[PDB]
Each structure stands twice: as C-alpha cells, then as structure tokens.
C-alpha cells in the first residue's frame, strides 16, 4: 500500500530499537524494510530528525549516549519524555550504529528527494566538528562516499532550493557557508585522510566547488585556503629543510623526519592535492581544447612555492653520498614525486648536451641545487643511482615523472629501454606466404609485400622456408632474417646492392627505383624493418647509418657523410666545413647513381641555379644523402614509410639511436679488441704524446659499446670487419679509423672519413680530454655523425 503509512507505534516502539547492536546481514533487512517505509513521511522523519539531535546529545560520548538512552530508552517504556532511569548496558555502540545507518541512510535517503532550524545542519556542521567525527579513518571511505552523496545529494537539489527555501530551507539549508570549508583544510589535512581517502576527498573538494551553484562559493573558498596551504608549507618541512641535507657518510638520522613526505595525509600528498586542485579545475573541469595549460602551470610557477625548492633541493642529494636510514624513496620520492610531478616552478625543460664535457668533473651530489630552476640536473646529478634506479623502476614515469623534456638525460635510453622490457609488448588470421628464403626481399613483392602493409602483422605469418610454413613458427626470422643478408644484399635487383655511399652496406643503393616491382618491394622493407621490431628476431645485415632514420619522419644525415661517404662530405670540403665562402656551387647536383628519378637533382633549393650560402652549406652536401635515401629513393621511401608506420605500435619511439638500432637490428657489432688496441692506427695520432698509446695501451677502459658505437660513429656504415679493421667499411672500406692527430684545438671532433678514415684526435691530455667527448659522441648514434 502506497501512500502516508503508520505515524507511531512503529516508530514509538522503535525507541529501544535505536540503542542496538548486533552483526551486519541483521541489519540488511532494515535496508529493506526502512526502504518500504518510503511514502509515509512520518516514520521517514520524526524520530530521525530528533535522532540527530540524539547523537549530538548522544554518540559524543557513552555518557551524553547513556543521557539519551534515559531520554529514549525509556520513553516508550512510559510517555516520549525520558522515564525508567535506564542505564545504559552496552547494547549499543556509536562507531557501529553510526556506520549502520550511514550506510542505510546512503541507501534509502538517496531516493528521497525534495526536501534536502539548522539544527540538523549544526548537527552536519557544528557536530561535525567533533573529534568523535574527526577520531576516525577506518569508516572514512564511507564518510567520503557521503560526502560526495551530500554534494550531489544537494548539487542536484543545489539547483535552487540551497537559495530556494521551498524545499531545501526544510532544515533551513544556509545558502552556502565557509566555516566547514575552512574546516577541511583544518582538518582533513591530518593523516585522518587516508590515501584512498585522500583521492575521493580531492573529489570531495572538487564537487564541492561544483555542486550547484557552489562554483561560486565553495570553489573561491577552497581557492583562499589553498592559498593558506603555501603559508602552512612548512608547517615542518622547514625542520625537514635539512635533517636530510646534513646526513652524508655513514650518518644516521633515523625516521624523525621520515614521517612527513614519507606520511601522505600528512605531507607530499598535501603538494599533491594542491596539484590536484588546480589540475581538475583545469585538466578535468576545463579540457585542452579550453584549458590554458599556462595558467594551470601558472599556478605552482606564479604561485610556486620558491622558498621550499632551493632551499629544501640542496637537502636531499646528500642521500647519494650518505648511508643514512630514512633518506630514501620513503622520503625522497615524495619529493621526486611532488618535484617532479608537479612539471612546475622555475626552469625544469632544459634538456642538456654532451660536447666535449670539458675533459671530466665529479658532480659529488645535487650541490646546493636551487628550485626546479635547476632541478632536471638535480636528477642528473643524483643520477649516481637515479639513472640505474629509473632503469628498474617506470612507476616514476607514471608517476613523478608528469611531463618531461629534459629527463632523457637521467631517463637515458638505457631507462626507455628497459621500459621497453615490458613495454617491449607495447589477431593473425593467415598470410599464406612461401618467400624463397634467399629470395625474400626478391620475391617479397609477389610472395609477402608486407601483404599490403600492416595485415603480415595483422594476419598468421605462413611465410615458408620454401613452402614449410611452420619450422620457427609463422614468421620464420631465424635465418629468414639471416638470408636477408642476401635478399636485402639484393645482389640480383637495384633495390639494395653495394653503393657507391656504400659499398660494403647494402641500403636502397639509389637504383631501386630502376626495378619494375621496386614500390612492392620497398613496402616489404617498410615491414621487415617495422616487422622485425614487430617480430620475432632481426636481420644481421647492416644497411647503413642512414636507413634507419629513414624509417620513420626523419631527416636524413649529413655529418655522416663525412664518414659514411667522404666523396660527398669531405671530397666536398669546397661547402658545408673546411671551406666555403657562400660562393662556392661545388657542382649541386651528385651523382644519380638512382637513374630513376634522374633530374640531375638540385643539392640545394636551386642546385645548379641558386648559390650554395650560409643557409644551404649543409643543404648542398645533406642533399646528396637526401639524393641518398630520401629523394633518389622517396617514392621508394613510400613504401618503406607506410609499412614502418604501419608496422609498429609505439615501439621504443625515440629511445634506441641508430647506433642503438645497429646495435639492436644489426645486433652490438662484434670487435676484435686485441687487434684494436696494437690497431686503429695507433700511432697516427701520435702515440704517447700524453694521448693516443694511452687510449691504445688502456685500450678496453671505455667500454664495449663505445668501441662498437664508434666504429658506427666512425664509418657511417657500420659493418665492422674487425682484423683491427685496416678494412674499416665505408665507401671503399680502408683504413683502421685512422687516428691522425692533426694537432688541433685539443677538442676538435674526428671528422672521419671512412674511405680514407681520419679520426681526428687532437693533442688531447692523459686520459681525461681523450675520454667523456669521444666517449659519448659516439655512443650518439644519429646525432654525433648522423642528424648532427
């Protein structure tokens, strides 16, 4: 029966009712039977109004709670006033009633609606001052779950009635306050907010600001508090400034201090709020297409917080050199989180070079850093064990780690890549191929051409050693891959063959173009490259140093040519270096060994029209490696740019250099050391002049990379032939990366030149100038002889 239901006698025996306590799944059927007792309004209210004055006279403590069982449990012993002296027994207790109906209030009294004398409000408000509600954690969830259910609750009702009194002015809803809304702030900031409590509570603030109407009042005034917090910052950071700034050494500080970031709801996560607050108002509330993104940054960089940054930055590296106790992540990542999540303050993009590193430093710790100003190099001077750290841990990336240009320094590729040992995984219903398993490439154009692009990918890889569609699985690699060394090689088409960039390596060899089937043949180089990255194993064979750039949207490489083909950058000395007066055309056009694409093609916007200047030095010998692989063979490229983007899926995208890729695709090329070292020319640099003998009698002191990754940044065209590598490949493939000397500025970079290699090494100094510049560059891959 629908309608007004029974006033009392429910409700008047219900008095004892309400000073219970028993096990829950009791308590469900009063879920449901106070959801039947929707339609009545009087067994709805009455008693329930009062039994928030109740708890306010009750719950606040067992006596106050005995007051109103004398009060309650009692009147309907005898009229509804008090009677029976009764003495509370314990029936009853405030943490489990008060979750009992909280969660029946949850419940039921959100169907109800329309009509939500402060007293009740005094109760939602005054009561709720009470440590009795600010003396629990583990109901939390649930008292945070109510209060987004009293902001939507009222943000649906907010509507009007909060001002409109028809409805909401039942229990005389002010028209918004700040006495709780400063409270939160007085408040929740204490480890009462657990982290879980902590995120729904920052979704607490945000409807808070929202509701209804609430965007006026709630949103401005949670604004001003947040503006306190800078004042509260250091409520004990500052006595935090430098309890881990003195460490260092076997020093012992113990967790004094630990529990300040280390404790979120009692720090850090208070930076992380604040983030949180005007991220939601800006990424959440607002969108990028609408949010200014500069005010949101703005805020936390106009609004910074300076003072804590250089003076706290200078405090924390000191771990790095300490073996302290509680002066790691437990602390620090709090820090690295806030300082790095926050991608706010001063300067923190501004990623930083190799050079000549000068000849060498040691970057003890983060020396009395500033604020984030200078914080990317905070990491990097931290990188001791930041770098080894960041190569075990990507939560960083997720987390601290917010937005990021600079990092790469400290976030190495070797970090990425180890990323992509899981992201290394970042529907293949058949590919009925044979593929001639010498052929491959040769017969990839009516066998497999990518079978149009990213389906191979997308499709079971039947691709046969000569019609075994299994033996390694679909998708044979094994020496499917060790083939293409002779499909690939493609000694019988001009797709790929000796060049005259490079002989010894096997890329487009400009040709191609020539062959009938060359564009299907470029899309089975556009997979294999993109498909071996989206595949099991990779081609030995080596293509060049400048293929791999070509896979996707990039450039291709001039400096290398410098190594990988002297005839177009050092024969070319006349432009780019050496010499050049903005005067000298040097014949802009190279040779079109393509005969495709055959205009004589301009090496600069004009070639044999316009001068080759200031502006088109490097245009006229980039050109020619433009008239490489990337204009002899564009169209070519088409293809070998579809399927590359095609086959792929955010694949290690921007970590793995070509060097790295050489190191990868062509596997670390291998190194006869033993030969390197009584080899490389030693003694053209002039062996022993306080350098030279020292890199060639401390010979394996660099590294196995750096001795691989040179002879990439040496030659331009990888493929190392070892025997000291007096047939070092390149154009003709000579010489064991000479090491003349040429006595110049100590510091001036090998401009080597893999037909007649030269590899500058000016009169360096003990060890210290020969190692780091060397070092790095020529770990770079594409970028100390490739890009740049």
Request: with cysteine.
């Given at each position: 029966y629908f309608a007004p239901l029974i006033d009392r006698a429910g409700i008047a025996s219900l008095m004892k009712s309400v000073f219970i306590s028993k096990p829950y799944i009791q308590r469900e059927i009063y879920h449901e039977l106070f959801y039947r007792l929707c339609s009545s309004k009087q067994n709805?209210?009455?008693?329930?109004?009062?039994?928030?004055?109740?708890?306010?006279?009750?719950?606040?403590?067992?006596?106050?709670?005995?007051?109103?069982?004398?009060?309650?449990?009692?009147?309907?012993?005898?009229?509804?006033?008090?009677?029976?002296?009764?003495?509370?027994?314990?029936?009853?207790?405030?943490?489990?009633?008060?979750?009992?109906?909280?969660?029946?209030?949850?419940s039921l009294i959100d169907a109800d609606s329309r009509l939500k004398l402060r007293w009740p409000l005094w109760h939602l408000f005054s009561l709720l001052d009470r440590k009795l509600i600010t003396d629990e954690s583990v109901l939390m969830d649930l008292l945070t779950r109510i209060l987004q259910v009293c902001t939507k609750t009222l943000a649906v009702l907010s509507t009007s009635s909060n001002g409109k009194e028809n409805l909401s002015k039942k229990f005389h809803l002010p028209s918004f306050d700040e006495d709780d809304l400063m409270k939160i702030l007085s408040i929740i900031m204490l480890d009462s907010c657990t982290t879980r409590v902590f995120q729904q509570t920052l979704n607490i603030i945000y409807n808070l600001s929202k509701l209804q109407?609430?965007?006026?009042?709630?949103?401005?005034?949670?604004?001003?508090?947040?503006?306190?917090?800078?004042?509260?910052?250091?409520?004990?950071?500052?006595?935090?400034?430098?309890?881990?700034?003195?460490?260092?050494?076997?020093?012992?500080?113990?967790?004094?201090?630990?529990?300040?970031?280390?404790?979120?709801?009692?720090?850090?996560?208070?930076?992380?709020?604040?983030?949180?607050?005007?991220?939601?108002?800006?990424?959440?509330?607002?969108?990028?297409?609408?949010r200014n993104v500069k005010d949101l940054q703005s805020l936390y960089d106009k609004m910074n917080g300076g003072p804590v940054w250089s003076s706290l930055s200078e405090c924390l590296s000191q771990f790095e050199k300490s073996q302290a106790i509680n002066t790691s992540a437990t602390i620090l990542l709090p820090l690295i989180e806030s300082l790095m999540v926050v991608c706010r303050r001063s300067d923190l993009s501004q990623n930083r070079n190799t050079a000549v590193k000068y000849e060498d430093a040691k970057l003890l710790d983060f020396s009395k850093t500033r604020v984030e100003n200078l914080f990317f190099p905070f990491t990097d001077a931290h990188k001791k064990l930041l770098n080894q750290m960041i190569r075990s841990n990507p939560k960083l990336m997720s987390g601290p780690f917010a937005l990021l240009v600079k990092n790469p320094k400290v976030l190495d590729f070797d970090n990425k890549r180890y990323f992509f040992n899981a992201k290394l995984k970042s529907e293949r219903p058949k590919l009925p191929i044979t593929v001639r398993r010498e052929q491959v490439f040769l017969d990839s154009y009516r066998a497999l051409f990518f079978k149009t692009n990213d389906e191979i990918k997308n499709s079971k890889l039947e691709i046969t050693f000569k019609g075994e569609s299994g033996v390694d699985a679909g998708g044979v690699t094994r020496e499917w891959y060790q083939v293409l060394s002779r499909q690939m090689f493609n000694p019988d088409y001009a797709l790929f063959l000796p060049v005259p960039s490079d002989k010894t390596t096997f890329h487009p060899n400009r040709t191609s173009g020539i062959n009938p089937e060359h564009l299907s043949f470029f899309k089975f180089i556009g997979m294999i490259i993109?498909?071996?990255?989206?595949?099991?194993?990779?081609?030995?064979?080596?293509?060049?140093?400048?293929?791999?750039?070509?896979?996707?949207?990039?450039?291709?490489?001039?400096?290398?040519?410098?190594?990988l083909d002297p005839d177009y950058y050092k024969?070319?000395?006349?432009?780019?270096?050496?010499?050049?007066?903005?005067?000298?055309?040097?014949?802009?056009?190279?040779?079109?060994?393509?005969?495709?694409?055959?205009?004589?093609?301009?090496?600069?916007?004009?070639?044999?029209?316009?001068?080759?200047?200031?502006?088109?030095?490097?245009?006229?010998?980039?050109?020619?490696?433009?008239?490489?692989?990337?204009?002899?063979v564009k169209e070519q490229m088409d293809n070998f740019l579809v399927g590359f983007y095609a086959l792929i899926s955010k694949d290690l995208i921007t970590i793995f250099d070509e060097?790295?890729?050489?190191?990868?695709?062509?596997?670390?090329?291998?190194?006869?050391?033993?030969?390197?070292?009584?080899?490389?020319?030693?003694?053209?640099?002039?062996?022993?002049?306080?350098?030279?003998?020292?890199?060639?009698?401390?010979?394996?002191?660099?590294?196995?990379?750096?001795?691989?990754?040179?002879?990439?940044?040496?030659?331009?065209?990888?493929?190392?032939?070892?025997?000291?590598?007096?047939?070092?490949?390149?154009?003709?493939?000579?010489?064991?990366?000479?090491?003349?000397?040429?006595?110049?500025?100590?510091?001036?970079?090998?401009?080597?030149?893999?037909?007649?290699?030269?590899?500058?090494?000016?009169?360096?100094?003990?060890?210290?100038?020969?190692?780091?510049?060397?070092?790095?560059?020529?770990?770079?891959?594409h970028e100390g002889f490739g890009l740049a």
């Open positions: 709805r209210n009455d008693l329930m109004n009062t039994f928030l004055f109740i708890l306010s006279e009750g719950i606040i403590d067992q006596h106050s709670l005995e007051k109103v069982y004398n009060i309650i449990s009692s009147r309907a012993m005898g009229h509804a006033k008090t009677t029976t002296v009764r003495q509370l027994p314990s029936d009853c207790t405030p943490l489990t009633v008060a979750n009992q109906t909280i969660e029946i209030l949850q109407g609430c965007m006026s009042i709630f949103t401005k005034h949670l604004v001003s508090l947040a503006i306190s917090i800078m004042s509260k910052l250091k409520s004990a950071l500052d006595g935090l400034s430098r309890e881990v700034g003195t460490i260092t050494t076997g020093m012992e500080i113990n967790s004094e201090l630990l529990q300040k970031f280390t404790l979120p709801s009692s720090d850090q996560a208070k930076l992380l709020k604040i983030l949180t607050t005007v991220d939601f108002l800006y990424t959440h509330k607002r969108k990028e297409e609408e993109g498909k071996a990255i989206r595949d099991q194993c990779f081609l030995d064979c080596h293509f060049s140093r400048e293929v791999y750039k070509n896979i996707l949207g990039r450039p291709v490489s001039l400096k290398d040519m410098e190594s024969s070319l000395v006349w432009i780019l270096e050496n010499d050049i007066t903005d005067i000298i055309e040097e014949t802009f056009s190279v040779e079109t060994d393509d005969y495709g694409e055959h205009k004589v093609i301009n090496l600069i916007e004009g070639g044999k029209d316009i001068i080759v200047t200031e502006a088109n030095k490097q245009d006229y010998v980039k050109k020619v490696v433009e008239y490489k692989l990337q204009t002899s060097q790295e890729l050489e190191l990868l695709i062509s596997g670390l090329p291998d190194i006869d050391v033993d030969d390197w070292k009584n080899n490389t020319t030693y003694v053209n640099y002039t062996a022993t002049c306080k350098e030279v003998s020292y890199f060639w009698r401390a010979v394996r002191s660099f590294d196995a990379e750096e001795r691989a990754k040179l002879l990439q940044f040496v030659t331009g065209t990888s493929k190392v032939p070892l025997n000291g590598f007096k047939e070092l490949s390149g154009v003709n493939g000579v010489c064991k990366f000479s090491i003349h000397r040429d006595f110049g500025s100590s510091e001036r970079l090998p401009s080597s030149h893999t037909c007649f290699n030269q590899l500058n090494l000016p009169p360096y100094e003990s060890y210290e100038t020969l190692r780091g510049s060397l070092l790095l560059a020529i770990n770079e891959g």
